[PDB]
Amino acid sequence: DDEEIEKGVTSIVAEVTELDEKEIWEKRDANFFQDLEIDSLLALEILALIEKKFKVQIPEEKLVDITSLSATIGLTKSVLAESGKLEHH
Ligand SMILES: [Zn+2]
Ligand SMILES: [Zn+2]
Numbered sequence: 206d207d208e209e210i211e212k213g214v215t216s217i218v219a220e221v222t223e224l225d226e227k228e229i230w231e232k233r234d235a236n237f238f239q240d241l242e243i244d245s246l247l248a249l250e251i252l253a254l255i256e257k258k259f260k261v262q263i264p265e266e267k268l269v270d271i272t273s274l275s276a277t278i279g280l281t282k283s284v285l286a287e288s289g290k291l292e293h294h
């Protein structure tokens with residue numbers, strides 16, 4: 206479900222970065238490491254929490270595309286589609 210994925214990923218990134226969910230959402234097209242003070246350890250932790258939340262496996266190599274909230278949401282959606290459990294509109 207698009208909305209459920211967008212809110213679940215926003216919640217994860219807000220928790221990891223210790224920022225507000227609304228403010229993260231406003232900065233959804235912003236670059237993670239340039240603008241919102243993220244590390245590689247924090248991106249690894251986002252990836253892990255997304256795996257657990259949506260009950261999916263995501264290969265490590267995909268840390269390449271954890272570069273913005275929008276990119277992370279797109280990653281989650283594509284990985285859900287590969288698992289036959291995305292309902293997109
Ligand atoms: Zn819904
Ligand atoms: Zn949307």
Ligand SMILES: [Zn+2]
Nearest residue numbers: 220221222223
């Ligand atoms: Zn803290």
Ligand SMILES: [Zn+2]
Nearest residue numbers: 224225226227
């Ligand atoms: Zn808050």
Ligand SMILES: [Zn+2]
Nearest residue numbers: 233234235275
């Ligand atoms: Zn956009």
Ligand SMILES: [Zn+2]
Nearest residue numbers: 256262263264
């Ligand atoms: Zn994994």
